[PDB]
């Protein structure tokens, strides 16, 4: 029946709640709370290393990010368990946010770094370890490649955190490689 397990579900709820807060309070008021630490005095507010992934600035990217999260996140949770999804999510949110702030500073957000990690993870784990029962469909490979391309060449309305995305993708591929060593 239900495709989305507890972790898949709770992330989606978190993103919706944060999105609603941003419409009520405005993007900036919520960023000040949830953004990657933008000053040394904030460096021990440990939630900020992750909560950047919960903010979205447009209707299109929250929808697309949550669609991919629901599908890939959902597939990982179902087949490999809630723990595996939690770890891919925390590690990719941390390292994608690191790389992004490093090159472009701290004013960014969105779940797409995590989504790209899931794309990479599901693809490579499926390739190298098909008995895992996970697999990235050809159609979704094509979809993801175009979305990446669109990001890189600024084809959306909006300024893109290409650091976070590509770093996300590298994290997912790395974790899948390690997970399938055997």
């Amino acid at each position: 029946r239900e495709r989305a397990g507890p972790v898949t579900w709770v992330m989606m709820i978190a993103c919706v709640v944060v999105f609603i807060a941003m419409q009520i309070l405005g993007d900036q008021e919520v960023m000040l709370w949830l953004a990657w630490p933008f000053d040394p005095t904030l460096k021990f507010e440990f939630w900020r290393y992750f909560t950047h992934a919960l903010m979205h600035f447009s209707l299109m990217h929250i929808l697309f990010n949550l669609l991919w999260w629901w599908y890939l996140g959902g597939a990982v949770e179902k087949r490999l368990g809630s723990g595996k999804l939690i770890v891919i999510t925390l590690i990719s949110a941390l390292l994608s946010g690191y790389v992004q702030q490093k090159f472009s500073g701290p004013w960014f957000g969105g779940l797409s770094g995590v989504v790209y990690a899931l794309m990479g993870y599901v693809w490579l784990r499926g390739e190298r370890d098909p008995q895992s029962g996970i697999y990235l469909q050809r159609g979704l490979i094509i979809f993801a490649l175009i979305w990446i391309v669109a990001g890189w060449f600024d084809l959306f309305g909006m300024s893109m955190a290409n650091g976070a995305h590509i770093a996300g993708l590298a994290v997912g591929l790395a974790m899948a490689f390690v997970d399938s060593l055997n």
Partner: peptide, 4 residues
């Protein structure tokens, strides 16, 4: 603000 950049989006991921």
């Amino acid at each position: 603000i950049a989006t991921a």
